Design a protein around this ligand. Structure first.
Ligand SMILES: [Mg+2]
Ligand SMILES: [Mg+2]
Ligand SMILES: [Mg+2]
Ligand SMILES: [Mg+2]
Ligand SMILES: [Mg+2]
Ligand SMILES: [Mg+2]
Ligand SMILES: [Mg+2]
Lengths: 214, 118, 50, 227, 107, 126
RNA sequence: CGCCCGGGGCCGAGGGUCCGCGGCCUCCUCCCC
RNA sequence: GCCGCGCCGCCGAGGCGGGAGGGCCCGCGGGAGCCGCCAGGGGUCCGCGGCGAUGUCGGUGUCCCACCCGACCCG
RNA sequence: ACGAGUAGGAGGGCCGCCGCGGUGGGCGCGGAAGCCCCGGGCGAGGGCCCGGGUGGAGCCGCCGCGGGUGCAGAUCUUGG
């Protein structure tokens, strides 16, 4: 099989080993140094047809080709970041949406960077749904959900809007009770956390976010 | 003497239409309707003219004969092509590319023939 | 006349962005080949001094 | 068929003659850069040894007076004396906040004396020279301000003097060489920004709390805030 | 309430010149420059009411309108901040309320 | 009918350059006249006065003369002046002249619809 | 840039390679499955 | 003050030749070769949400008005 | 790379006006010129195009050509 990169990343864009150190690590001294058409048969003989025939229409004008760039990867291939305060089990605070000011429990970061967020539903009526980390305030309260098993099918396509009235399907309810049945026993170990997740967050007189510790 | 005839018809022609900062030519053998040296349809010994057919369907590829220079009655050879869109373009492409007849106006005549068929 | 002409310079060169070599690594090592070696010896020496 | 394969390898040998030619020039400027990397350190450690020698014997080791100077024009173009306005053109300082290196001699210091209220010069170190040529460094090819992106521009117009890469240009400006005149004149005047953090007083001399005049080693602080 | 109280203290100006494309906000709790760092990048909103009804995202149309902005940098040493809005703030908003949202969050 | 490309047109100034003291007098038309007075404030470009149209306000050459729809205006008077826009119809729209009758405007509109040429005044008189 | 990491603001003008690496071109071992 | 020798001091200003080993290094030994990566000749997404004909959407620069700032009448 | 400007000089104008030779198989009672417009626009500007209304018979683009060719001033002239 293809061996891994024998040059560890010392720094960004810098390899740990030189050209001569990698030559010894790889032992390079042991090394040394169409069909654009298809044929078909018919009932006057055989006809050779051409794949991708010439266009039947040409526009009056055409846009020139763009220049070649680099580093402009699509969104699916982008690097995903996550704040160090957002660890699996932290109680987040939603800022936008209908559930704004409500407190949720962070479970896992999805491949597209969005955070899998749960209420749970049995506490503050917030099901398993995505949530952006930019629109979320992470508190300093963490619950140990290392034993919580999240099913693999909870991907971004699972929470992608199906695009005439929305209705929660039986799969969403089953995946809700599968995760809630594991969070409720460990939430009860932390006293006064059942009502803390029920409560909503809001700024009162004299409370300034630049000096409030979350 | 195309370049000699160009300097006369460069800015003085009954076909030149100068307005809205644009210059268009109304000569019959112009493919882009553009008043330029290359696309001017009366200046060169080899001109390509893609006109609509006399009826509502088909195009007319007008070529300028080699010996038909100072005799306008027998100077242009018209080619009526009434086929499907893909085959009509293949005919115009072969008239220009295979004959080495104004290869610079090859795609200019294909885009004009495509607009006439609409 | 064609025998007397030069090669037609059909290559169009445009203005370059001039990325900062002090901040961009690949630009620095394009002007200074030893810059990658000095950067590597400086990081490894810092880890050795720690 | 035989002519095609023959004319094909002639194109391949043309490309092979270029890639090998690049690796040779890159290997040369690699060894020049590592030699400068070692020379820049030795020059400093030599003076430390000689200074420790004199202090050990109770004597004094007077270092050599600086040969290089970076001159920044601080005043504008309104109301300038004709003699002062002529010297500022000979230093290529035709606008406010621009810098050019000057090879210090008696014919140059007296020119810097005739324009002290309009300039703020000193003795730049190696970091100051490298940052100016890397970030603010531009080239004068045909009186055209060309940015320094590749070593081909330097080797084309300074190759006959032994300057092939940017490190050769920095080594010629910092350590004044035999080709400092052509190397410095090949660099476009550094269009510097306003001093981040503000000045002290632009109309007075640096000794009396201002900014004009000659700040011997304090010009580096001014470069960090303007570069 | 999910936004911080701020006051439109005026535009970025000198003494005889005014740059209306930049606004000076005064946050109710920020009275020092070392405290403005938390608000760098927060969404700003000038919510007001008009006569004609306008469409509301995620709701029914009403008279409420808004001009969105964002805190860009600090201003001075007394906790003032600068904000740039998609449309320059109208001069009638001087001394009125500006909602400083808690997003984009960095906590 | 959509143009070939509809870029974001940037206009450095939308207001009109009014003539100095064009409001205080009905005899002074709004058409711009460069003030040449020896003590004129606008000529000496004092702060707070009317601005002087100079080069620098010129729009981008790529988006100059482009209508808000993306096309460029071109005045036509008959069928022949319309058929020259057959090609490059993705970059120029037709505009029927004002002095042509409603009898001939119907023919120019029905012919431009066949040639996929956009008319800025398709239903003018009818 | 002396070495590394991070944050905020502003914008993407143009539109027919150079410079760094890594895997394989050599056989295996361990971790992960 | 020069010149010669000797002693001594000089992070390693240092250079040469060799010797006991220990171990840190090399644009030495890797390129007319295929594949990818990218701090590499100026931006892209092969990411996404809300709103929908009788009251809403965009424009309405040049119709009125309001406020902050600037602003004295031309020749 | 550069960009101030009176007096002044020079160039460009697909700025505008009147008339002429050409030219557009131009335009027009199915409505020309003029005039009005909280109509749509374009140009950095001179200006221009389009729409509506009014009007009732001529009018315009392009290449050249000829000027009695562009007004806020002159205690300007005439009229209101
Ligand atoms: Mg002065
Ligand atoms: Mg003074
Ligand atoms: Mg305008
Ligand atoms: Mg005066
Ligand atoms: Mg006359
Ligand atoms: Mg007169
Ligand atoms: Mg008058």
């Amino acid at each position: 099989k293809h061996h891994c990169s024998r040059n560890p990343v010392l720094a960004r864009g810098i390899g740990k080993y030189s050209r001569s150190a990698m030559y010894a690590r790889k032992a390079l001294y042991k090394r040394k140094f169409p069909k654009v058409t298809v044929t078909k048969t018919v009932g006057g003989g055989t006809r050779v047809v051409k794949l991708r025939k010439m266009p039947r229409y040409y526009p009056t004008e055409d846009v020139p080709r763009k220049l070649l760039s680099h580093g402009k990867k699509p969104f699916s291939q982008h690097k995903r970041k996550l704040r160090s305060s957002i660890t699996p089990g932290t109680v987040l605070i939603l800022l936008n949406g209908r559930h704004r000011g409500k407190r949720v429990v962070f479970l896992k970061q999805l491949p597209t960077g969005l955070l899998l967020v749960t209420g749970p539903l049995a506490i503050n009526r917030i099901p398993l749904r995505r949530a952006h980390q930019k629109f979320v305030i992470a508190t300093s309260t963490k619950v140990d959900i290392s034993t919580v098993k999240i099913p693999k099918h909870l991907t971004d396509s699972y929470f992608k809007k199906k695009k005439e009235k929305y209705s929660v399907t039986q799969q969403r309810k089953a995946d809700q009770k599968f995760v809630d049945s594991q969070l409720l026993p460990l939430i009860k170990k932390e006293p006064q956390l059942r009502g803390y997740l029920r409560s909503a967050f809001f700024l009162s007189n004299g409370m300034y976010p630049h000096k409030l510790v979350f | 003497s195309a370049h000699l005839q160009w300097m006369v018809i460069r800015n003085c022609s009954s076909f030149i239409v100068k307005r809205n900062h644009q210059v268009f030519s109304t000569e019959p053998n112009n493919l882009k309707a553009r008043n330029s040296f290359r696309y001017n349809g009366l200046i060169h010994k080899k001109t390509v003219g893609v006109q609509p057919a006399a009826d509502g369907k088909g195009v007319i590829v007008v070529l300028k004969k080699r010996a038909g220079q100072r005799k306008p009655a027998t100077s242009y050879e018209k080619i009526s092509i009434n086929k499907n869109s893909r085959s009509t373009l293949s005919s115009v492409r072969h008239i220009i590319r295979k004959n080495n007849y104004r290869k610079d106006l090859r795609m200019a005549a294909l885009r004009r023939a495509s607009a006439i068929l609409k | 006349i064609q025998r007397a002409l030069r090669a037609p310079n059909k290559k169009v060169k445009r203005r370059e962005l001039k990325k900062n070599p002090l901040k961009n690594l690949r630009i620095m090592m394009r002007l200074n080949p030893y810059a990658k070696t000095a950067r590597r010896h400086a990081i490894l020496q810092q880890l050795e001094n720690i | 068929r035989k002519q095609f394969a023959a004319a094909k390898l002639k194109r391949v040998k043309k490309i092979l003659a270029a890639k090998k030619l690049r690796k040779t020039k890159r290997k040369v400027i690699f060894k020049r850069a590592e030699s400068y990397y070692k020379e820049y350190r030795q020059i400093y450690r030599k003076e430390v040894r000689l200074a420790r020698i004199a202090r050990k014997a109770g004597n004094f080791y007077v270092p050599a007076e600086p040969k290089l100077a970076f001159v920044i024009r601080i005043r504008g173009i309104n109301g300038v004396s004709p003699k002062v306005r002529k010297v500022l053109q000979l230093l290529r300082l035709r606008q406010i906040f621009n810098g050019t290196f000057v090879k210090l001699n008696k014919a140059s210091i007296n020119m810097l004396r005739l324009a002290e209220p309009y300039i703020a010069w000193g003795y730049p170190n190696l970091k100051s020279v490298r940052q100016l040529i890397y970030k603010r460094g531009y080239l004068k090819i045909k009186n055209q301000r060309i940015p320094m992106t590749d070593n081909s521009l330097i080797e084309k117009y300074l190759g006959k003097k032994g300057l092939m890469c940017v490190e050769d240009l920095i080594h010629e400006i910092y350590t004044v060489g035999k080709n400092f005149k052509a190397a410095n004149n090949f660099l476009w005047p550094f269009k510097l920004s306003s001093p981040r953090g503000g000045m002290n007083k632009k109309t007075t001399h640096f000794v009396e709390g201002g900014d004009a005049g000659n700040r011997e080693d304090q010009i580096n602080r001014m470069i960090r805030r303007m570069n | 309430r999910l936004w911080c109280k701020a006051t439109f203290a005026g535009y970025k100006r000198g003494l005889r010149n005014q740059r209306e494309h930049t606004a000076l906000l005064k946050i109710e709790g920020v009275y020092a420059r070392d405290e403005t760092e938390f608000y760098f990048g927060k969404r700003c909103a000038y919510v007001y009411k008009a006569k004609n009804n306008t469409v509301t995202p995620g709701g029914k149309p009403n008279r409420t309108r808004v001009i969105w902005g964002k805190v860009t940098r600090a201003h001075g040493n007394s906790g003032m901040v600068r904000a740039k809005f998609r449309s320059n703030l109208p001069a009638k908003a001087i001394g009125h309320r500006i909602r400083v949202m808690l997003y984009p969050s960095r906590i | 009918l959509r143009p070939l490309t509809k870029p974001k047109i940037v206009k450095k100034r939308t207001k009109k350059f009014i003539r100095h003291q064009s409001d205080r007098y009905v005899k002074i038309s709004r058409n711009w006249r460069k003030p040449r007075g020896i003590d004129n404030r606008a000529r000496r470009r004092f702060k707070g006065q009317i601005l002087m149209p100079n080069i620098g306000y010129g729009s981008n050459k790529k988006t100059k003369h482009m209508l808000p729809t993306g096309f460029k205006k071109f005045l036509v008077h008959n069928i022949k002046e319309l058929e020259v826009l057959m090609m490059s119809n993705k970059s120029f729209c037709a505009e029927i002249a004002h002095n042509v009758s409603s009898k001939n405007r119907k023919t120019i509109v029905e012919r431009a619809a066949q040639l996929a040429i956009k008319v800025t005044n398709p239903n003018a008189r009818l």
